[PDB]
Amino acid sequence: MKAKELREKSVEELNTELLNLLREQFNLRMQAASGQLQQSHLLKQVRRDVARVKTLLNEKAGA
Amino acid sequence: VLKRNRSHGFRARMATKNGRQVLARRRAKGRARLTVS
Amino acid sequence: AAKIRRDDEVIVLTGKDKGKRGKVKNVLSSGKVIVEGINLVKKHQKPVPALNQPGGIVEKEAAIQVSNVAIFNAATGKADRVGFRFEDGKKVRFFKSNSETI
Amino acid sequence: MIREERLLKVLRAPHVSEKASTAMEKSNTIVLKVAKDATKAEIKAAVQKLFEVEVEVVNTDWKKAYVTLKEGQNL
RNA sequence: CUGCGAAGGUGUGCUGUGAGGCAUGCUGGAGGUAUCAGAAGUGCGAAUGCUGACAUAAGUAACGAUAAAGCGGGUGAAAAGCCCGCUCGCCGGAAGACCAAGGGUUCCUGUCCAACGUUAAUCGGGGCAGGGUGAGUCGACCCCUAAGGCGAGGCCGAAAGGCGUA
RNA sequence: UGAUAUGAACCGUUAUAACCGGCGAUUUCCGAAUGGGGAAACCCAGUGUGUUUCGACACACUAUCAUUAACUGAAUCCAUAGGUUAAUGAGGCGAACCGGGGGAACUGAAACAUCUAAGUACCCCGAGGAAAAGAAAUCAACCGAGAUUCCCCCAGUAGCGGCGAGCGAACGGGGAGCAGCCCAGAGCCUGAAUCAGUGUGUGUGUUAGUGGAAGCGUCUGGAAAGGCGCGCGAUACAGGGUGACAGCCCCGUACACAAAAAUGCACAUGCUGUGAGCUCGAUGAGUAGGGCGGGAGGUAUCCUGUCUGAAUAUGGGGGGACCAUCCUCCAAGGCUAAAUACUCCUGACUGACCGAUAGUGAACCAGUACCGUGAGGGAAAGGCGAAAAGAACCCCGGCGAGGGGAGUGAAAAAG
């Protein structure tokens, strides 16, 4: 999903960016460190998603 | 350590032109350790 | 633009098992393909205390060069070269010698 | 305002060790790595927001903090 | 010419006065060569020629209290000195301990260990990895002041600077 | 889903995988580092605005030198210097060649040191993408030629030097090149041509590519590209990888083709700006000569410290001086395509130069290990197999190393 949030407004897209970091990013890192994260591909997927959301914020906001 | 840096350190080399030439020669030779530090 | 793909019926041209048909399982970036049931190699599997303890002798498949196999025509019962042609803007593969689409 | 993203940056990672496990199971405290400065107030605020939990107190090269939770804990 | 086995290397045999070449066995398993020519970083016994190659010398530091040692047990290729149990001899208003100043990962856990041309070490502070320093009321820093030091004017001195107030 | 380097967890299958190319956002600390300082990857900045938390958060600007503009303004009325603010530009690093400002030794001689080496090695500043030079105060003593540089003849000549070793020309001829203008200042007549900058359209080209014919079988052999017998194709047998030496198992070459965006090389068109003919002046309005000192030395020609003052197509200067005969030639502002020079980086092509003590120092995780305060110099070390399935189980030993069986492979005198 790349264009799904391309038509979202700043407020709502800023919110999901907040949720991506708060959940599924902090929690995953704790699980990986503690060793209960059986599947590691989530960390890759969430990190790319955060970057994808973040670039849209910069592309939309300002320029 | 203090005397070594103040005699052959990066800032000492760049202060005078000849030291600047020394850094240029090191860069051209591609030495990993440009100077002492 | 690769002649051999994931699911292809191929026949060996050269090697200890020339002439036997098979289906390609996967293709390596080094111009090598793995086809099951022909290039059997007896590998002495060192035992490990991990979750898997197969040990003994395993019958694995050894990759072979792409040029050593050709797509089986399945109609003339012989190996045949394959080329590419553009149809309705989609690139497709086709045999030779009464060439027909795959 | 930049307090927000500052709280998102003071935490670095959680610390795993038998002392850490013993503290968690006995005293209900979690030990985690924090930023170099990571003043106690910032650590407390960050734990509140990100883990939505309540902390009794926080007492702190790298810096580690023993965050103490109340009776109610989640992770 | 060429997998019924190339070249190189190791033997034998034949030919020419001499440099050598042709035909094979063994080893080896991937390309090689003649005749008529041309192109030279082409052949080695020494220049104190250059780098390894039979050789006359083996990797682990504390020898400087006239208070006291010896016996047993465990570990170890090694035990007069470490650890555990049974005694004696010093200190004991400190040869205890807790602070300031000074010193700033040495104090806490598992290890380079069957040893070159015969190397035979009584110390578990070594080089290379993992942890601990947790604070409202321990203390300092934060607030006010003297001496010392510094500091827009004025006072002393033709300026500046010094003394000196905020 | 880089490689070393297997596996597991994920993504993609009738058009958002990866990889390659182009257009953007983002780009901390250290290094020309611009706020300051120091011992380069260390600490410490100031001001203004928003921040759901009035203990906050984030970002831009700010150095010096030069130019322009604005404000203030002396000493000494005005002017001027210095100071403040804003915009633009300059600074550093990395080959070769060329230009400007300066400047050696060794190697050479029977000792008149100068002459040679040498306008060299090395060092300093700036510009261009070739630079310098580049349309005659020049050659030819009155046949002619007409910008500069480089290469090939005249020529190891004519000259020059204790005429000793050395160094080292012009004119003429034969080629490539063969396209020059403006300012010492003007009267009259203008959307009058061409050239420049900024856009669009067409054609072509550069930075990922597509389509792309053509040998089956047999003997020796574990395995076939070569041998024997039998074809097709040849605009294509160019090269490399491809189980033994491959046109026709493949990946490719020749021929025919492609452009969302960016960029480069020719035209047309729209806007702005610079600009032709017919004529009249001047020939650099403090620019010489002469006097004094130094270099290329009593001295031809060139450049200048200070103190005066006339000209220049009308008129002023040169190698066989003669009414300063005649012909030619116009002397102190820039710009000037191209031929000639140079290869640190890319792609293609070339090879009787080289094949691991060779070639560059490095065919390789070598600009390394190691030595030194720093600068500088600068190692050793290439190849198992088609596929590494790399070694189940058992014996000796120390739950090693090493060696002896079995199993895999054509081969274990490949472990």
From Swiss-Prot, chain B:
UniProt entry tagged with the keyword Ribosomal protein = yes
Q: Which UniProt keywords apply?
A: Ribonucleoprotein, Ribosomal protein
Among the GO biological process terms of this entry, one is: cytoplasmic translation
What Gene Ontology molecular-function terms does this entry list?
Answer: structural constituent of ribosome
Looking at the record's lineage, which domain of life comes first? Bacteria
GO annotation, cellular component aspect: cytoplasm; cytosolic large ribosomal subunit
Its quaternary organisation is: Part of the 50S ribosomal subunit.
Family to which the UniProt record says this protein belongs: Belongs to the bacterial ribosomal protein bL34 family.
Name the chain's protein.
Answer: Large ribosomal subunit protein bL34
- Whose protein is this, by species? Escherichia coli (strain K12)
Q: Which residues of the full protein are shown?
A: 9 to 45 of 46
From Swiss-Prot, chain D:
Indicate yes or no for the key word Ribosomal protein. yes
Q: Which branch of life, at top level?
A: Bacteria
What keywords were assigned to this record?
Ribonucleoprotein, Ribosomal protein, RNA-binding, rRNA-binding
* InterPro entries, A to Z: Nucleotide-bd_a/b_plait_sf (IPR012677), Ribosomal_uL23-like (IPR013025), Ribosomal_uL23/eL15/eS24_sf (IPR012678), Ribosomal_uL23_CS (IPR001014)
Q: What are its GO cellular component terms? A: cytoplasm; cytosolic large ribosomal subunit
Q: Does the keyword Kinase apply?
A: no
From which residue to which does the signal peptide run? none
Alphabetized GO MF terms: rRNA binding; structural constituent of ribosome
One of the GO BP terms on file: cytoplasmic translation
Q: Which PANTHER family match?
A: 60S RIBOSOMAL PROTEIN L23A
By sequence similarity, the record places it as follows: Belongs to the universal ribosomal protein uL23 family.
Q: How does it assemble?
A: Part of the 50S ribosomal subunit. Contacts protein L29 and trigger factor. Might also contact SecE and probably does contact SecG and SecY when the SecYEG translocation complex is docked with the ribosome.
Give the protein's biological function.
One of the early assembly proteins, it binds 23S rRNA; is essential for growth. One of the proteins that surround the polypeptide exit tunnel on the outside of the subunit. Acts as the docking site for trigger factor for Ffh binding to the ribosome (SRP54) and to nascent polypeptide chains.
Name the record gives this protein: Large ribosomal subunit protein uL23
